[PDB]
Amino acid sequence: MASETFEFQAEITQLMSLIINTVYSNKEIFLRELISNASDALDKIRYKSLSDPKQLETEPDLFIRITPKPEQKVLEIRDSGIGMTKAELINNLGTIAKSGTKAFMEALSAGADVSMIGQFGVGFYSLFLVADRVQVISKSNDDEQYIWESNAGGSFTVTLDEVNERIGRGTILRLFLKDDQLEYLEEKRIKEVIKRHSEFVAYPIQLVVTKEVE
Ligand SMILES: CO[C@H]1C[C@H](C)Cc2cc(O)cc(c2)NC(=O)/C(C)=C/CC[C@H](C)[C@@H](OC(N)=O)/C(C)=C/[C@H](C)[C@H]1O
């Protein structure tokens, strides 16, 4: 499949550099942000299903699932929420600077906790705390499955997905972790972060653990 390439709005590039280069601790907050996002997407499909219950048939179980892939230095955060169409990915993940982008950068620079990023509506970008590359793989009931991809540089690509597992419906955040952030592949560390910062989640959070049979 041929990829389409898009330039990030300048303010989003600025934001990504600020997060990549300027913040030094409490990097674990990325997980609470991505779980909150996943929870929002699940709320949206649950709400939609109230008056359109057939919307659930593409994936009847509502869940958040976290999968460390230590060989690839990858952490995946999956939800069976509403998902995003190709146009939604292009419009919401880089071409248009959302309300809050500039406000957050100003707040961070004046000394706000990076943990406040979610209150500005740009917490997705907190993944660049631990990752230097990301794929967002998404399946809306209203479109085909698509892959958005960024390498923390100034452009991103969107490509029709003929390479990943079918998700019935929903989204996978595939984070390619930095070498100094591989603690986030460890079962105990993930459980710790979830229990400490994501205590009030309405959906089950599943952790996929790969272990050698002795
Ligand atoms: C297309 O509109 C989306 C919301 C919109 C981008 C505004 C929004 C809503 C949030 O809960 C959090 C937001 C931003 N924070 C963000 O930083 C952004 C820009 C997220 C992109 C969307 C997720 C990849 C995406 O995460 C996911 N797991 O699907 C997400 C939260 C999608 C929403 C369901 C969808 O309604």
Curated annotation (Swiss-Prot):
Binding site for ATP: 33, 37, 79, 84, 92, 98-100, 119-124, 171
Single annotated GO MF: ATP hydrolysis activity
Cellular component, GO annotation: cytoplasm; cytosol; nucleus; perinuclear region of cytoplasm; plasma membrane; protein-containing complex
Compartments reported by the entry: Cytoplasm
Keywords, in A-Z order: ATP-binding, Chaperone, Cytoplasm, Nucleotide-binding, Phosphoprotein, Repeat, Stress response
Record remark: domains: The TPR repeat-binding motif mediates interaction with TPR repeat-containing proteins like the co-chaperones AHA1, CDC37, CNS1, CPR6, CPR7, HCH1, SBA1, SSE1 and STI1. CNS1, CPR6, CPR7 and STI1.
Protein name as catalogued: ATP-dependent molecular chaperone HSP82
Organism expressing this protein natively: Saccharomyces cerevisiae (strain ATCC 204508 / S288c) (Baker's yeast)
Gene name of this polypeptide: HSP82
Residues represented out of the complete protein: 1 to 214 of 709
